[PDB]
């Protein structure tokens, strides 16, 4: 019944800080702070560092969790987007290199 | 009053005139079929209120009613023929209560074959009352088969209950019927099976009956079957009614609200006749249960226990009365909750604080048919809100009157218990 | 009049095939469902 | 029994009216507290019976 | 009157529940729709046998999406196979709302009342159901003229009824206006149930197969070595447990990231597995040979 | 046509309809329901979306006398495509209650319509087995000599299920069961291992009786069939060899690990014990404070 | 924050949340106790100056 209240659509919060194990403080990316109850069959093992989390729009409740990779505008480049400029391409500044 | 509200209203009158046969027929007389009525509800529910007065004297009234039944069991689809045929069937069922007139049984059985969508519930119950407590296999064969074949909701309910009705005091002769019903997959036949154990094994406590009904509540996930199994424990266990709170303590910790709702009726049934201080402690979180129909059962169940008692000799009655009034007034409570409070208040001060619901007579140490049939009927009403006037068969006055037994009139009672005045005349 | 306006967003980054993260052009990040015509290989980060 | 009673009514508890976090600026003597909710204006508002 | 009037208990058979959900889930986020085949018996007992969908010629839930030819053609087909029976309602989907009809869908329901006296409009939630169980509710619309002069209470008595407050306030206004809502029940045949419970057929073969034993040895090594690494933490954890209160412990010293939980669980997993492994292999040698 | 179909996964709904359809047409044995099968194919995964009934009358006096409503099929195909375009004709179901030699006359009628080889789903409608009673057969065409030159025959393919979000939950919703075809937990896998042994004994009888019927009830000697049977015996394990010995060493390793893993669990369980007795320790101080408050309360009772 | 006072028992108050409002001035306040710049206490449902007992 609790896995059926994780319905789409959902809005992203970011967990600010614990203050209980069925209550925490989130910080919405709407721009409002809330003090929300935490759903069960969710571990608090990984709610401890500040991480993205999914919120239910019409009540403000932590209805499921997101992995720390999601919800960034940035990404790790270098897949093929890194320059070709090695140590070899740079000329001197041997002191600065070392 | 309109609809079934009017069907209730013409019937309340027989509560009033219960035990008075003199003006018995007379009071319902204008409202009887073939005379002046504004609506069908009057014509039917007048026969209903007639059967409440005449139960156990009803040989006169049985005969009248038979003519009404064959009339309306050869026509249908007209609203009038149906609403009439329902109240007539209740009438005749009470009137033929315990006589086992075969002619009445056949006539009620045509109502089912006529396939009225309304009347077949009344008529199925009425049948079960007529033949009551013989356990006759032929009767059961008729009632079980037409239950499987029809899919009609009102009709099927009636006949599963009727299979339970006819078995009473059978005990260990109900074992074939009990197993068959609890192994049907329909909810209706499971529901009545629980009550087959209740009525049969009433008046005598058994180890067996208890093992078999705990299995039912747990094993079935349909909410009505869970309820039915709890109620049934009360009836078997009205011999020792001081074991009952101890069992159903457990069954009031239940997540399922139906189970909780049935625990109310069991303590009701056991602890009706004599008050018990243990029982009040169990019924206390049921008034505080946050599911509307659990409050509904609970409030009524408290009133029946503490019936025929003052408020100045029991601290609870004062608080519970005060509460009933709180529930009625609030428009912040649902209608289920309002039903529980009003109806319980009326059971408590009933009769002028001079009638009790007896749990069984101790004078001979046997069970009394009128009381039992009254309560099991009472416990059914979420499926039909009109039916809760059947408690008039189970309100018995208990009172000391001296009789000069050599001319059978009433001279004023003089007790060895001493008088004291209450000192008011202003 | 039998048409509606549709809030434009962009796929911020894939979570799963049923659930995508779309950041909308009004502020808040949402976690959204799919139409099943929308091609799953056409849904990736940058696309509007 | 605590586990199954708890999950079942927890759904009605997740029909939350919401919350906000402010901070006590100063009190007043009508039993009211001036709070500033963080990206909003201040509210002069009464305490419950919980504090 | 012609009848006392009360709202139908819907005994929705297995095939119809399952079918409306398939069609409507596929149709997210569009409105989806189609007609209900059934039979009306008793004072409230509607058995819905099957459903069939109505091809979209509109946006869905329109009278541009209900085609006369289509309706005619489907009926004409159902006679050959005996599935022809009378229309007992119509289904639709809101996947953006709970069970609560919108203004357009009331207008669709107003046209169905002309067609059939007891037609229901059934709102199927394909994703938005708020309980473990599927939330579906059936509505019927009767005139404002009976409801206002206070005949609505009479109609709702002599039945258990259903109250929902899924959209809270919005629902109540709508509920009121339309009519009522009543418990929905499910008709199961024991043929139907048995097919559904079995889902595999090479289950008998599979229970006496196993994997290569190279990756089994690998799981056993990985399990033992990993439990050393959380066993190191586990000793450190019980240095603490010096702070009063269960909650304070979890917040302050991060008692939730528990080493205890991850050891017990990983020991359990490798353990249960090695019971089965020995069981399967030891059966295989002596049974087969 | 393609013979590339290695699995068939069938939705719960397809099974449930075809089965449901058998009593909706009110047919009994030796009268057939057949219906159109709609879904995806041309792929390894066959995904069976939906089905609808056809009228079907079988006369078995001559297996060349048959009823099929032709026009019905074309009409219905076009309407379904407007709800959802992924529905194509991928075959037809036969209602059982067994296979015949006769299903091949009928199959030809369905090759006509299709661009895959029609799937012949023999749905057994009394429902025998602790598995699914649904067989899948696709007609495969290959040159083969067993008294024929070119054979059309039907090759079995596995039947399993796959379901949507909605459809799975709707199954679960009907069921009051926790499943036991899952092979999830310890409990579930125990049940399964015993079902597997019972599955194996029953098939072996069917093989044992088939062979008694050639040699004593005189069916013909079928070299090709036996040939296959022979290899069963050839690829048997043989013990009292180092192979048997490698198993013994294997047993030792796994049971050692079970003991070492279990010893971990002996700490876990024991550790917790101490923690409860801590909770009992705290509850007596709390109960003392209560006992003091309740001492005072009793004086009020006397007073009043 | 009282933005300007309009002489008719109405005022333009600036909630710091940004919509400005043509409010009415009710009881428990005086209009020479309000000066531009003064803080005002506003009725939530229909905005009105209900006072300022503030320090």
CSV table of N, CA, C and O in Angstrom, one decimal, chain G residues 1-3 12 15-16 19-20 23-26 30 35 37 39 43 45 48 50-51 54:
chain,number,residue,atom,x,y,z
G,1,UNK,N,4.5,46.4,5.6
G,1,UNK,CA,5.2,47.6,5.9
G,1,UNK,C,4.2,48.6,5.2
G,1,UNK,O,3.7,48.3,4.1
G,2,UNK,N,3.9,49.6,6.0
G,2,UNK,CA,3.0,50.6,5.5
G,2,UNK,C,3.6,51.5,4.5
G,2,UNK,O,4.5,52.2,4.8
G,3,UNK,N,3.2,51.4,3.2
G,3,UNK,CA,3.8,52.0,2.0
G,3,UNK,C,3.4,53.4,1.9
G,3,UNK,O,4.3,54.3,1.6
G,12,UNK,N,-2.1,51.5,1.5
G,12,UNK,CA,-1.4,50.6,0.5
G,12,UNK,C,-0.3,50.0,1.3
G,12,UNK,O,0.5,50.8,1.8
G,15,UNK,N,3.2,43.8,1.5
G,15,UNK,CA,3.6,42.6,2.1
G,15,UNK,C,5.0,42.4,1.5
G,15,UNK,O,5.0,42.8,0.2
G,16,UNK,N,6.2,41.9,2.1
G,16,UNK,CA,7.5,41.7,1.4
G,16,UNK,C,7.4,40.6,0.6
G,16,UNK,O,8.4,40.3,-0.1
G,19,UNK,N,2.7,41.3,-3.6
G,19,UNK,CA,1.5,42.0,-4.0
G,19,UNK,C,1.2,43.0,-3.0
G,19,UNK,O,1.3,42.8,-1.8
G,20,UNK,N,0.7,44.2,-3.6
G,20,UNK,CA,0.4,45.4,-2.8
G,20,UNK,C,-1.0,45.3,-2.7
G,20,UNK,O,-1.7,44.8,-3.5
G,23,UNK,N,-6.2,48.1,1.4
G,23,UNK,CA,-6.8,47.5,2.5
G,23,UNK,C,-7.7,48.5,3.2
G,23,UNK,O,-7.7,49.7,2.7
G,24,UNK,N,-8.5,48.0,4.2
G,24,UNK,CA,-9.3,48.9,5.0
G,24,UNK,C,-8.7,49.0,6.4
G,24,UNK,O,-8.0,48.0,6.9
G,25,UNK,N,-8.9,50.1,7.1
G,25,UNK,CA,-8.4,50.2,8.5
G,25,UNK,C,-9.5,50.1,9.5
G,25,UNK,O,-10.5,50.8,9.4
G,26,UNK,N,-9.4,49.0,10.3
G,26,UNK,CA,-10.4,48.5,11.2
G,26,UNK,C,-10.0,49.0,12.6
G,26,UNK,O,-9.3,50.0,12.8
G,30,UNK,N,-5.0,53.5,15.2
G,30,UNK,CA,-5.4,54.9,15.0
G,30,UNK,C,-4.5,55.2,13.8
G,30,UNK,O,-3.5,54.5,13.7
G,35,UNK,N,2.2,55.8,10.4
G,35,UNK,CA,2.9,56.9,9.8
G,35,UNK,C,3.5,56.1,8.7
G,35,UNK,O,3.6,54.8,9.0
G,37,UNK,N,6.0,53.8,6.9
G,37,UNK,CA,7.2,53.1,7.4
G,37,UNK,C,6.9,52.1,8.5
G,37,UNK,O,7.6,51.1,8.7
G,39,UNK,N,5.1,49.3,10.8
G,39,UNK,CA,4.7,47.9,10.5
G,39,UNK,C,3.2,47.8,10.9
G,39,UNK,O,2.8,48.3,11.9
G,43,UNK,N,-5.0,41.1,8.4
G,43,UNK,CA,-6.0,40.0,8.5
G,43,UNK,C,-5.7,39.1,7.3
G,43,UNK,O,-5.8,39.6,6.2
G,45,UNK,N,-7.5,36.6,5.7
G,45,UNK,CA,-8.4,36.1,4.7
G,45,UNK,C,-8.7,37.4,3.8
G,45,UNK,O,-8.4,37.3,2.7
G,48,UNK,N,-6.8,43.7,5.8
G,48,UNK,CA,-7.2,44.8,6.6
G,48,UNK,C,-6.2,45.0,7.7
G,48,UNK,O,-5.5,44.1,8.1
G,50,UNK,N,-5.6,45.6,11.2
G,50,UNK,CA,-6.2,45.1,12.4
G,50,UNK,C,-5.4,45.5,13.6
G,50,UNK,O,-5.8,45.3,14.7
G,51,UNK,N,-4.3,46.3,13.3
G,51,UNK,CA,-3.6,46.7,14.5
G,51,UNK,C,-2.2,46.7,14.3
G,51,UNK,O,-1.6,46.5,13.2
G,54,UNK,N,2.8,46.2,18.4
G,54,UNK,CA,4.2,45.9,18.4
G,54,UNK,C,5.0,47.0,19.0
G,54,UNK,O,4.7,48.1,18.9
